[PDB]
Design an enzyme around this catalytic site. Structure first.
Site, PDB file in Angstrom:
ATOM      1  N   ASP B 299       0.920  -1.074  -0.032  1.00  0.00           N
ATOM      2  CA  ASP B 299      -0.116  -0.048  -0.036  1.00  0.00           C
ATOM      3  C   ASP B 299       1.056   1.321   0.096  1.00  0.00           C
ATOM      4  O   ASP B 299       2.128   0.961   0.008  1.00  0.00           O
ATOM      5  CB  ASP B 299      -0.904  -0.262   1.148  1.00  0.00           C
ATOM      6  CG  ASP B 299      -1.669   1.083   1.414  1.00  0.00           C
ATOM      7  OD1 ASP B 299      -2.494   1.553   0.451  1.00  0.00           O
ATOM      8  OD2 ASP B 299      -1.948   1.648   2.748  1.00  0.00           O
ATOM      9  N   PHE B 369     -13.229  24.713   8.798  1.00  0.00           N
ATOM     10  CA  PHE B 369     -13.773  24.613   7.354  1.00  0.00           C
ATOM     11  C   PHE B 369     -15.333  24.144   7.371  1.00  0.00           C
ATOM     12  O   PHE B 369     -16.032  24.122   8.188  1.00  0.00           O
ATOM     13  CB  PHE B 369     -13.160  23.059   6.909  1.00  0.00           C
ATOM     14  CG  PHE B 369     -13.158  22.589   5.671  1.00  0.00           C
ATOM     15  CD1 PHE B 369     -12.551  23.384   4.560  1.00  0.00           C
ATOM     16  CD2 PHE B 369     -13.906  21.292   5.248  1.00  0.00           C
ATOM     17  CE1 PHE B 369     -12.611  23.246   3.294  1.00  0.00           C
ATOM     18  CE2 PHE B 369     -13.839  21.072   3.764  1.00  0.00           C
ATOM     19  CZ  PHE B 369     -13.217  21.844   3.037  1.00  0.00           C
ATOM     20  N   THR B 370     -15.777  24.707   6.063  1.00  0.00           N
ATOM     21  CA  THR B 370     -17.163  24.779   5.808  1.00  0.00           C
ATOM     22  C   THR B 370     -17.841  23.845   4.830  1.00  0.00           C
ATOM     23  O   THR B 370     -18.899  23.456   5.106  1.00  0.00           O
ATOM     24  CB  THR B 370     -17.682  26.258   5.708  1.00  0.00           C
ATOM     25  OG1 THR B 370     -16.957  26.545   4.383  1.00  0.00           O
ATOM     26  CG2 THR B 370     -17.445  27.102   6.612  1.00  0.00           C
ATOM     27  N   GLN B 372     -18.864  24.630   2.111  1.00  0.00           N
ATOM     28  CA  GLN B 372     -19.544  25.702   1.009  1.00  0.00           C
ATOM     29  C   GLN B 372     -18.508  26.473   0.449  1.00  0.00           C
ATOM     30  O   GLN B 372     -18.769  26.443  -0.780  1.00  0.00           O
ATOM     31  CB  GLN B 372     -20.725  26.461   1.901  1.00  0.00           C
ATOM     32  CG  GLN B 372     -21.341  27.351   1.021  1.00  0.00           C
ATOM     33  CD  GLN B 372     -22.426  28.253   1.766  1.00  0.00           C
ATOM     34  OE1 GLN B 372     -22.756  27.838   2.939  1.00  0.00           O
ATOM     35  NE2 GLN B 372     -22.869  29.245   1.364  1.00  0.00           N
ATOM     36  N   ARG B 374     -15.361  26.154   1.400  1.00  0.00           N
ATOM     37  CA  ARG B 374     -13.947  25.235   1.186  1.00  0.00           C
ATOM     38  C   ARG B 374     -12.757  25.938   1.387  1.00  0.00           C
ATOM     39  O   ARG B 374     -12.027  25.867   0.596  1.00  0.00           O
ATOM     40  CB  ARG B 374     -14.161  24.657  -0.397  1.00  0.00           C
ATOM     41  CG  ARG B 374     -15.640  24.078  -0.849  1.00  0.00           C
ATOM     42  CD  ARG B 374     -15.377  23.181  -2.002  1.00  0.00           C
ATOM     43  NE  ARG B 374     -14.378  23.663  -3.204  1.00  0.00           N
ATOM     44  CZ  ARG B 374     -13.919  23.070  -4.150  1.00  0.00           C
ATOM     45  NH1 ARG B 374     -14.078  21.737  -4.170  1.00  0.00           N
ATOM     46  NH2 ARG B 374     -13.395  23.589  -4.833  1.00  0.00           N
ATOM     47  N   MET B 375     -12.785  26.363   2.388  1.00  0.00           N
ATOM     48  CA  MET B 375     -11.361  27.072   2.863  1.00  0.00           C
ATOM     49  C   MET B 375     -11.464  27.138   4.648  1.00  0.00           C
ATOM     50  O   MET B 375     -12.694  28.036   5.005  1.00  0.00           O
ATOM     51  CB  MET B 375     -11.160  28.116   2.174  1.00  0.00           C
ATOM     52  CG  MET B 375     -12.253  29.459   2.085  1.00  0.00           C
ATOM     53  SD  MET B 375     -11.777  30.879   1.234  1.00  0.00           S
ATOM     54  CE  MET B 375     -11.752  29.779  -0.309  1.00  0.00           C
ATOM     55  N   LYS B 387      -7.314  29.707   3.934  1.00  0.00           N
ATOM     56  CA  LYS B 387      -6.473  28.598   3.350  1.00  0.00           C
ATOM     57  C   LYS B 387      -7.142  27.453   2.778  1.00  0.00           C
ATOM     58  O   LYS B 387      -8.327  27.239   3.561  1.00  0.00           O
ATOM     59  CB  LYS B 387      -5.699  28.169   4.495  1.00  0.00           C
ATOM     60  CG  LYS B 387      -4.459  26.961   4.084  1.00  0.00           C
ATOM     61  CD  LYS B 387      -3.890  26.169   5.248  1.00  0.00           C
ATOM     62  CE  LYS B 387      -5.087  25.095   5.824  1.00  0.00           C
ATOM     63  NZ  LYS B 387      -4.472  24.452   6.913  1.00  0.00           N
ATOM     64  N   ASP B 514      -7.551  -2.341   1.888  1.00  0.00           N
ATOM     65  CA  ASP B 514      -6.758  -3.441   1.775  1.00  0.00           C
ATOM     66  C   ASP B 514      -7.145  -4.768   2.384  1.00  0.00           C
ATOM     67  O   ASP B 514      -6.757  -5.668   2.258  1.00  0.00           O
ATOM     68  CB  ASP B 514      -5.334  -3.142   2.480  1.00  0.00           C
ATOM     69  CG  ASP B 514      -4.545  -1.842   2.296  1.00  0.00           C
ATOM     70  OD1 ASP B 514      -4.141  -1.704   1.110  1.00  0.00           O
ATOM     71  OD2 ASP B 514      -4.939  -0.890   2.775  1.00  0.00           O
TER      72      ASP B 514
HETATM   73 MG   LIG Z   1      -3.188   2.754   3.358  1.00  0.00          MG
END
Ligand SMILES: [Mg+2]
Ligand SMILES: CCCCCCCC/C=C/CCCCCCCC(=O)OC[C@H](COP(=O)(O)OCCN)OC(=O)CCCCCCCCCCCCCCC
Ligand SMILES: CCCCCCCCCCCCCCCCCC(=O)O[C@@H](COC(=O)CCCCCCCCCCCCCCC)COP(=O)(O)OCCN
Lengths: 190, 674, 557, 29
Positions: B299, B369-370, B372, B374-375, B387, B514
């Site tokens: 992985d 963070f929201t 809506q 997106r920051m 950000k 996995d």
């Molecule tokens: Mg993994």
């Protein structure tokens, strides 16, 4: 898969080649080159056949060299029912047979040794055994000499004239041809 | 082997006695049949229905029951935990609830209906933290789902009610805010249910050495069965026949039980070596298979990399200084408690010593963070630090009457090409730059992958991650191949592909995606930091969480194969020599004179066969110590190692039956029993 | 007498390898599909005419070709024996054989067993002997050499899918190997005294006034090919202790050499087709050690001979109860061991009159599977089954993967090898058990005590292994014995030929790898010892109970 | 050839069949 055209053709060709051509070719060459051994090695007295030089017959007379016991089906030394007495070493019937044969051989040869050769007492494998080692054949020289009024030296050199040593001393035994030996014995007493 | 493990192995041995479960073990099944026959014979002889001593067939039957029950117990230790368990997945599926709604625009009638009871067309409400009850679609509200069980990644992905991001999945957690769902699968076939059925249902093959040993077992037991069975006619002809109790006991004491116990003996020795190596193996075949592995699928997130994508390098936006950008980032991600924002803060602190800007309680609204806009970000004082994604901040800037420079986008594309997700930062209407959230490889891994390639083991790296970062980490670690954006079906199908070539695969995974693949692999090492679903599927858990511990697992697999060969020689010598020791006694009843064949001067047929069963039981019990103690693990060519094994273990396996059976018989006679 | 026994064994083996070596290099061309030097235009004309296109065959097509030839021969020979009163070359108008006797003789000859429950002098007529029996002697010998050709090709061919053409193999083998050699051997036997003629039986009148009737068939050709193809079907009742079949010690020597000529030449050829003579030499060493030890044991047991003889009144105790005075006791011992090791069947002495050990050792050789210089072709692929088993257990015992001649061996090959090895001892033990639980079967016996069981065991072990030898006291000419032994012979032969062709099929689609740590050399004394051990231990684990209640029980008291 | 002997014969044949089937299907067994 086995296609019928090449499977049938292969089988029929091998059938003809190894059933007619091979036996026919061996018979032609055999007869042409070895016409006596191929027709049985027969002995003749002019017209009447007196046996093969290979088979060995049931001799019972007192003036003949007796071979082994036979153990063939109906009569001893029967070429039509060859076979040995398949008697194990643990079978008491075999001991009965050996004791009877030893008694008969000590009664027939009184002035020979008391220790009977192990061949004259035991039956051959095929039942048709024309051979006894010159020891077993020279154990019977007293009896056959008294019966035939020959001297032990005559019978010694006679048995020697019909012994057949093998090529090398360990692939077989020296052996006396009994049929031919007794026929020569008769031709001698004449 | 904690106390509870032994007690569970004992219960599962008692529960495997039933013939339907014993049928899958030929030697032990025949010992089971003979044990039952001697129980019936003893009950008969005790009822008077058959003349004879009931208590001797009782002793034989008791000892054969001990033999079978300890074989079941050894094979319940060494292999009963082997198969993959979808217990955590089943738990998530059984303890899920759904806020069924009425008037599904938004509604306020939340009916706490178990999520399993939901059918297609029904509308559901999920809010921050609540797991998605079942598969479906979004119709109102936008949030950031934690789709870590599908890809393996940890970055929250935005599901936003209309577009291409509108299909939630059952099982994944929701993080940001509310979201109403429209189920789209009856509970029979969700995604969670699909991979549950895919985990339990994937069987692991048998090592070819084990199959060969089974063929040898069956050949030898057929030979001995023919011999012992046809002994009756023969003997009956020879006067005094062989009693039936002696016949069944001779059969079930001549069969190669040592070889039968060799599998579980090497299994328990292998698991002991693994615990020594700091690996918790649940399967005994896993270690020998580790000896025989040719491939290694890996992985990426969590297994190779740390699994949280720390921050790497602040990048200016052609004019601002790096200090300013670092202050902005450390202020925006100041409240962020995910390891990514925390790593942003840490990196800013070290590179620009921004200790001054650490305040537990300063007047500063926290803007989380929201999904809506997106920051995330903060507003400390006359400032609006934000950000987030490049496009989110693009929208924010274009909406605030500003402008989005182009070189910022050039840096964003670069950071994407370097295998990292770029976080653009803004303070008002001026993009300050980019933060390269890069995925940190665990440690010194190139050396160990080179060592694995030198050991003759391919090294694939399948992930559920981007192709960019997948390729970046494949280069930066040294794996041979890599397949990015792989669903669990993809990993499982790739394992089936590889191990369908006749080779043995060995996956190393740490996540729920996995679980299928780990369940099907031959040597499935699950990271101890991984999820419980990954640790329940994998054959073995790695307490160091190092993804290159297959090197040590393979060293120990090769040591267990040297030990399997040594004790296989011992076992074959043992069953054969025991046959010669056992059979002369069986003829004494038929022909007196065949006591001469009884070289060991054993007492009787009864005492010889009782000694035989006691010996077969003790040798099966003591094969485990013998395997636990190793052998001279030296590099020896096939011929020299065969000669050494023959000499030492074969000669030991000849002398062991004669001495052992005679001393057990001497004990039976001195004690007075037989 | 030990010096002479040693000299006999040594000269036998020395001449045997002198002859076999060149013939094995000649057979390596047939295995390689190269036309023998002079025969390449006649091959074109012939194969074109016979419908044979030299198109390769996979293992299924090859196996089906061999089985089809054998079933066609079985049908033809059965009907030939059944209706021999219509067919020519019948001087003594003999009737057709029974249904059971016809079936048993057909199955025996088709399967290279040549078990005889009849008397050829008063049962068969020259046509049956010549056109059926010896034709099938050639065909069964060629079927066995063709199966080993396919197995050797499977071992030497790389990533191929076809084992060559079977019709070309049979035609080549017969026409260019069995036939010319058999013709030379036949004319030597005719020179030494054997018969070759289609005369009526000769009416002899003894030297005394007795009477004899000598049988006078075409003995020499059938004799040459019975020995050369390890068939063993004798023309007369006493198989080859008959003065008309083995007339002198010289022909007996040449008969043993013929019995071993083609198996030894197949071992040399197998050595030469792999470009590694040491493989053939390994097989020859493994076989020769066992052969020499068995010959010594039987010679000793027979020279000790019947104890009771000396006490009954004789000068020697040497066992001469079933032996011709033409070949001594040492030569009878050597031939017993040769014939039962070589899966031939021809006897120059009655093996029922052999001592206890002298009968144990030939029987024991028959029961281990007849891999010691075994039957023509059959012996080599039997020993290859045992070599695969030895390589399997060696790989198992060191922990690495099995590998023989560079080709890795799967578990399919292990399954097929185990089933092939087991099919014969299953037949032996189960048939002997069935014969001893039915009145029809144990009543056939002649000798009492453990030797009766030895007879039954020897008969069923001989039929199951396609040997043909018998203790011959057993009256095995009933419907029960005929059908039982027919089943045993058929299943032994073909249920061993089938897994072998499956193994050739799997092996021919592989590729020979390179050396590694899991590649033990299959030459040198370590693997010779491992292979001898495998053979003898399978045989012993299987038959030690049976042998303990027969020959050993008789020996001990 | 009685109840006991026939039971023994058929049981031996069942065991032979079982072991041969196991051998042919080693993988599962
Ligand atoms: Mg993994
Ligand atoms: C109580 C009654 C008896 C019961 C017997 C069961 C015993 C089986 C295991 C025990 C064997 C212990 C004997 C110890 C043998 C020590 C070997 C040795 O040290 O080898 C020395 C040299 C090396 O020759 P080289 O120049 O290096 O060759 C250069 C390389 N090609 O020759 C030799 O003698 C090699 C001799 C080989 C003997 C091995 C035979 C084992 C057969 C196992 C088959 C079992 C299968 C079961 C059947 C279904
Ligand atoms: C026939 C199969 C041909 C294909 C190739 C054969 C390969 C070898 C197989 C030989 C096994 C044959 C078993 C046949 C049993 C037949 C019994 C029978 O037929 O009864 C006869 C009349 O009844 C009897 O007298 C039978 C006497 C008892 C038969 C005893 C057989 C006992 C079975 C031997 C025991 C072992 C059998 C094999 C299992 C180990 C009538 O036969 P028929 O005249 O019609 O023509 C048959 C021509 N093929």
């Amino acid at each position: 898969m086995s296609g019928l055209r090449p499977a049938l053709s292969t089988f029929i060709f091998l059938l003809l080649i190894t059933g007619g051509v091979y036996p026919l070719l061996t018979t032609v060459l055999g007869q042409w080159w070895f016409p006596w051994q191929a027709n049985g090695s027969l002995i003749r007295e002019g017209d009447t056949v007196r046996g093969s030089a290979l088979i060995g017959q049931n001799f019972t007379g007192n003036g003949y060299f007796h071979g082994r016991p036979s153990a063939t089906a109906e009569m001893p030394y029967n070429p039509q029912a060859s076979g040995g007495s398949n008697l194990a070493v643990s079978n008491p019937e075999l001991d009965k047979l050996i004791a009877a044969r030893v008694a008969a051989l000590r009664a027939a040869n009184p002035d020979a040794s008391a220790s009977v050769p192990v061949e004259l007492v035991t039956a051959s494998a095929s039942g048709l055994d024309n051979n006894i080692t010159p020891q077993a054949a020279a154990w019977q020289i007293p009896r056959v000499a008294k019966a035939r009024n020959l001297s032990v030296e005559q019978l010694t050199q006679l048995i020697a004239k019909y012994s057949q040593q093998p090529l090398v001393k360990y692939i077989g035994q020296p052996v006396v041809n009994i049929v031919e030996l007794n026929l020569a014995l008769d031709k001698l007493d004449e | 082997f904690e106390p509870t493990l032994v007690v569970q192995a004992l219960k599962e041995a008692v529960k495997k006695l039933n013939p339907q479960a014993q049928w899958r073990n030929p030697v032990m099944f025949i010992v089971w049949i003979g044990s039952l026959l001697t129980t019936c014979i003893s009950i008969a002889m005790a009822s008077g229905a058959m003349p004879g001593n009931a208590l001797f067939s009782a002793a034989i039957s008791g000892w054969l029951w001990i033999t079978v029950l300890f074989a079941n117990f050894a094979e319940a230790l060494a292999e009963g935990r082997s198969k993959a368990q979808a217990n955590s997945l089943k738990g998530v599926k059984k303890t899920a609830f759904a806020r069924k709604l009425r008037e599904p625009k938004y509604g306020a009638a939340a009916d706490k209906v178990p999520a399993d009871q939901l059918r297609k067309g029904d509308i559901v409400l999920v809010e921050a933290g609540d797991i998605i009850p079942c598969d479906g679609e979004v119709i109102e509200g936008g949030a950031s789902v934690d789709e870590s069980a599908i890809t393996g990644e940890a970055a929250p992905v935005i599901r936003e009610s209309g577009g291409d991001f509108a299909s939630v999945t059952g099982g994944t957690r929701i993080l940001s805010d509310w979201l109403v769902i429209e189920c789209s699968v009856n509970p029979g076939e969700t995604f969670l249910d699909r991979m549950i059925a895919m985990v339990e249902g994937a069987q692991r093959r048998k090592t070819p050495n084990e199959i060969a040993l089974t063929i040898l077992l069956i050949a030898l037991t057929i030979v001995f069965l023919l011999a012992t069975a046809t002994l009756w006619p023969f003997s009956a002809w020879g006067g005094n026949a062989v009693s039936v109790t002696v016949l069944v006991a001779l059969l079930v004491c001549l069969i190669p039980t040592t070889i039968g116990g060799l599998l579980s003996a090497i299994g328990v020795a292998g698991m002991s070596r693994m615990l020594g190596a700091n690996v918790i193996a649940t399967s005994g075949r896993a270690v020998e298979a580790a000896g025989d592995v040719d491939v290694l699928l890996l992985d990426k997130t969590g297994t190779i990399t740390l699994g949280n994508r720390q921050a790497s390098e602040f990048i200016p936006a052609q004019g601002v200084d790096e200090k300013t950008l670092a202050d902005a980032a450390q202020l925006a991600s100041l409240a962020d408690e995910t390891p990514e924002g925390r790593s942003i803060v840490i990196l800013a602190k070290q590179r620009f010593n921004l200790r001054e800007r650490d305040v537990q309680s300063l007047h500063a609204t926290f803007v989380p963070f929201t999904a809506q806009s997106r920051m995330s970000g903060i507003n400390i004082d006359n400032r609006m630090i934000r950000k987030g994604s490049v496009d989110a901040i693009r929208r924010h800037v274009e909406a605030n009457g500003g402008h989005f420079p182009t070189d910022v986008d050039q840096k964003v594309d670069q950071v994407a090409r370097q295998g990292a997700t770029p976080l653009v930062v803004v303070e008002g209407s001026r993009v300050l730059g980019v933060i390269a959230l890069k995925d940190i490889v665990k440690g010194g891994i190139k050396e160990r992958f080179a060592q694995l390639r030198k050991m003759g083991i391919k090294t694939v790296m399948i992930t559920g991650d981007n192709r960019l970062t997948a390729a970046a980490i494949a280069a930066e670690a040294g794996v041979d191949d890599f397949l990015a954006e792989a669903t669990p079906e993809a990993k499982l199908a790739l394992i089936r592909q590889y191990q369908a070539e006749g080779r043995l695969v060995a996956m190393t995974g740490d996540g729920t995606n996995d679980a299928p693949a780990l369940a099907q692999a031959d040597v499935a090492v699950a990271m101890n930091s991984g999820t419980q679903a990954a640790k329940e599927a994998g054959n073995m858990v790695d307490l160091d969480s190092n993804p290159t511990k297959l090197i040590e697992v393979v060293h120990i697999g090769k040591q267990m194969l040297m030990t399997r060969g040594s004790l296989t020689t011992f076992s074959i010598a043992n069953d054969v020599a025991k046959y010669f020791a056992i059979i002369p006694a069986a003829f004494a009843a038929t022909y007196p004179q065949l006591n001469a064949l009884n070289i060991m001067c054993l007492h009787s047929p009864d005492s010889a066969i009782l000694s035989a069963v006691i010996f077969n039981a003790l040798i099966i019990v003591f094969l485990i110590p013998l395997a636990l103690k190793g052998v001279s693990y030296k590099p020896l060519t096939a011929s020299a190692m065969l000669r050494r094994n023959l000499w030492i273990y074969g000669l030991g396996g000849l002398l062991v039956p004669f001495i052992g059976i005679k001393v057990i018989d001497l004990l039976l006679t001195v004690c007075g029993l037989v | 007498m030990a010096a002479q026994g040693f000299l006999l064994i040594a000269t036998f083996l020395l001449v045997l390898m002198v002859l076999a070596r060149p013939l094995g290099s000649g057979l390596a061309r047939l295995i390689n599909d190269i036309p023998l030097p002079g025969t390449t235009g006649v091959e074109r004309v012939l194969f074109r005419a016979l419908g044979v296109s030299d198109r390769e065959m996979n293992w299924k097509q090859y196996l089906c070709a061999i089985l089809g030839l054998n079933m066609l021969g079985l049908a033809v020979l059965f009907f030939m024996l059944l209706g021999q009163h219509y067919l020519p070359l019948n001087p003594q108008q003999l009737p057709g054989l029974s249904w059971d006797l016809a079936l048993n003789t057909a199955v025996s000859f088709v399967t290279n067993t040549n078990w005889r429950s009849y008397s050829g002098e008063t049962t068969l007529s020259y046509f049956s002997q010549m056109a059926g029996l010896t034709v099938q002697n050639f065909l069964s010998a060629a079927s066995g050499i063709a199966v080993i050709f396919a197995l050797i090709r499977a071992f030497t061919r790389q990533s191929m899918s076809t084992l060559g053409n079977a019709w070309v193999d049979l035609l080549r083998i017969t026409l260019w190997v069995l036939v010319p050699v058999a013709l030379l051997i036949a004319l030597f036997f005719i020179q030494q005294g054997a018969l070759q003629n289609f005369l009526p039986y000769q009416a002899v009148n003894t030297v005394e006034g007795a009477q004899q009737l000598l049988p006078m068939g075409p003995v020499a050709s059938q004799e040459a090919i019975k020995m050369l193809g390890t068939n063993g079907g004798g023309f007369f009742n006493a198989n080859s202790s008959h003065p008309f079949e083995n007339p002198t010690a010289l022909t007996n020597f040449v008969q043993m050499l013929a019995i071993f000529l083609i198996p030894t030449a197949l071992c040399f050829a197998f050595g030469e087709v792999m470009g590694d003579r040491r493989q053939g030499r390994m097989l020859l060493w493994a076989m020769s050690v066992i052969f020499v030890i068995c010959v010594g044991v039987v010679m000793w047991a027979e020279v000790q001979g019947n104890p009771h003889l000396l006490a009954l009144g004789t000068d020697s105790s040497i066992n001469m109860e079933g032996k011709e005075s033409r070949f001594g006791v040492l030569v009878s011992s050597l031939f017993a061991v040769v014939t039962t090791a070589a899966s031939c069947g021809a006897v120059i002495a009655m093996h029922d009159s052999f001592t206890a050990l002298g009968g144990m050792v030939p029987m024991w050789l028959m029961q281990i599977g007849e891999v010691v210089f075994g039957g023509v072709g059959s012996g080599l692929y039997g020993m290859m089954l045992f070599v695969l088993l030895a390589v399997f257990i060696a790989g198992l015992m060191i922990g690495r993967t099995p590998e023989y001649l560079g080709k890795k061996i799967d578990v399919r090959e292990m399954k097929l090898t185990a089933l092939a090895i087991l099919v014969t001892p299953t037949l032996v033990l189960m048939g002997a058990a069935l014969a001893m639980m039915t009145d029809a079967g144990r009543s056939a016996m002649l000798n009492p005590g453990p030797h009766g069981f030895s007879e039954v065991l020897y008969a069923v072990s001989s039929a199951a292994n396609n040997n043909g030898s018998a203790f011959a006291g057993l009256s095995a000419n009933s419907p029960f014995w005929n059908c039982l032994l027919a089943f045993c012979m058929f299943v032994g032969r073909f249920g061993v030929i089938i897994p072998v062709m499956a193994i050739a099929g799997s092996l021919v689609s592989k590729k020979s790898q390179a050396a590694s740590s899991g590649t033990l050399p299959t030459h040198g004394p370590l693997f010779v010892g491992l292979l001898i051990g495998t053979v003898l231990l399978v045989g012993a684990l299987t038959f030690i109970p049976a042998l303990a209640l027969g020959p050993v029980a008789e020996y001990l008291s | 050839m009685s109840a006991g002997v026939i039971t023994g014969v058929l049981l031996v044949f069942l065991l032979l069949g079982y072991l041969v089937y196991a051998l042919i299907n080693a993988e599962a067994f």
